[PDB]
Design a protein around this ligand. Structure first.
Ligand code: L2I
Ligand code: L2I
Lengths: 304, 304
């Protein structure tokens, strides 16, 4: 019993963190096999960030200009290439600590753990959701770029995010491991609009099932609703519209608790319309949307 | 910018997790040097838990009855001993992955990370506070016993907690690494009173400073208070009384933001008396008490 915002164990990712320095700029890199991946803005000075011509800036750089240090050992750079907004530094030594891994592009609403790093050293780990508007509400300071987001399935780390930027609004933006930004963002020191965000409805429902499993039941009611009726409420409260695909993914939680998905939607509808009335659910005074239905099943069953 | 409930990177602790089996009971053990530490209730059957005579139960056990497996390798047990509520299994091989470590007894109100494990395998990591009543509101299922709580200072892991029990109320209880319970709890399947809990005032203040640092300022006001006046409010709202020692630990955050500790106490007093009025602070709709002043400084500065 009990339900926590749990991150994956970060060990396999800690073994991959390196420091990348180019000129006077330092950030984090991810060393997998004989390649070190890092944000391409490592080649910029703070001044260059206003409108960097990355192709031109990278042309002035040679392999020996990228200083890569894994803790205390120095890696020999034998090649460099820019793919989208990431740099790939080929090194002469494969990382002995390379876990089984994949590079994945996650969907908005999905969750992952972040291993926040500075100077190639891990500082902490936390669980994030990729917002529907492709931003993340993380915890990053200057120097944290190159820190990555990931999920783990037994012995396989799926890397889904690399940190690049903090928008003027304090929210975070980054790329997949092929250097493609999530959202409309560009790696430039310019004010950039993040789209209108919404609350991840399927995740709030999943978390309401986790609450019922763990003892918090006060919000259950004698009502039901339809996808159409619920979606009118979701529209008014800026929630993502619920689809049958969302209802389908909630299947296992609905089967375990015996609470029909639309009956849980009616509890959520009443919570949206009336608030929590000064009460809490799983230690929170708001409706939590950073737990997917898979996260709830994993934590509630003890998946390792 | 941004502020998250951050756990320490769990890598150094993952390297210490083993599975301990005695008879039909399996739980987690912590392998440091040539000793494996685990809850002594590994020697009980579910039936024995009603009122176990641990000395008698352990006398029926021999070294070869404790099966210790680190992933896929089997450890040879050459000695066993019970210290308080923990068992110490001497093995013939020192853990090569043993980090620099210490065993510490933490104080209530202090925080730590938990590496939740099942069958010796890590499932996730989360940040906890030890409640003033010595319980923890964690996330643990049967089989998670032996999972540990810890803090890290550069390369030194200070182990402070080992999980033993879930009270009938769903809160968690455990011991320090010498097997002494935090609180009045005994390792027996009996209903046990947890003392009256309080909200950790110094931590809420520390978190209010983190909010100001990261942009959330709406709760700041034109008022001030005294320790005496604030403590009358803390009494009414079941908060721990604030002392000069608490004010002293908030010194660095008060110096950085330029907000006097008693001025922040007046903001907290108004929040206690008026609620949040449907607003949030650092993504929370309640006053958070699981961040110590040290945690706030560490995260706000990027300590690795
Ligand atoms: C040339 N180095 C500049 C790095 C700097 C950067 O890492 N900033 C930042 C700040 C806080 C959290 N996360 C990221 C940057 C990156 C992208 C666009 C503008 C500025
Ligand atoms: C003989 N094995 C019983 C283990 C069992 C136990 O681990 N239970 C438990 C359940 C959920 C979370 N955390 C812990 C136990 C321990 C202490 C007192 C009563 C029962």
């Amino acid at each position: 019993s009990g339900f926590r915002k749990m991150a994956f164990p970060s060990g396999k990712v800690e073994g991959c963190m390196v420091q990348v320095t180019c000129g006077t700029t330092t950030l984090n890199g991810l060393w997998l096999d004989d390649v070190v991946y890092c944000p391409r803005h490592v080649i910029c000075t703070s001044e260059d960030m206003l409108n960097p011509n990355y192709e031109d800036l990278l042309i002035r750089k040679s392999n020996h200009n990228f200083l890569v240090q894994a803790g205390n050992v120095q890696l020999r750079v034998i090649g460099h290439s820019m793919q989208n907004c990431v740099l790939k530094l080929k090194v002469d030594t494969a990382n002995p600590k390379t876990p089984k891994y994949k590079f994945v592009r996650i969907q908005p609403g999905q969750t992952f753990s972040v291993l926040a790093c500075y100077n190639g050293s891990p500082s902490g780990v936390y669980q994030c959701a990729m917002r529907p508007n492709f931003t993340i509400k993380g915890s990053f300071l200057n120097g944290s770029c190159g820190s990555v987001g990931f999920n783990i399935d037994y012995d396989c780390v799926s890397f889904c995010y690399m940190h690049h930027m903090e928008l003027p609004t304090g929210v975070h933006a980054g790329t997949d491991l092929e250097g493609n930004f999530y959202g409309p963002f560009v790696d430039r020191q310019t004010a950039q609009a993040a789209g209108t965000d919404t609350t991840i409805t399927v995740n709030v429902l999943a978390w309401l099932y986790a609450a019922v499993i763990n003892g918090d039941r006060w919000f259950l009611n004698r009502f039901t609703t339809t996808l159409n009726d619920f979606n009118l409420v979701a529209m008014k409260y800026n929630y993502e519209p619920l689809t049958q695909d969302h209802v389908d993914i909630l299947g296992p939680l609905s089967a375990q608790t015996g609470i029909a998905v639309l009956d849980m939607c009616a509890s959520l509808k009443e919570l949206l319309q009336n608030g929590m009335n000064g009460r809490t659910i799983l230690g929170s005074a708001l409706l939590e949307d950073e737990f997917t239905p898979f996260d709830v099943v994993r934590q509630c069953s003890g998946v390792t």
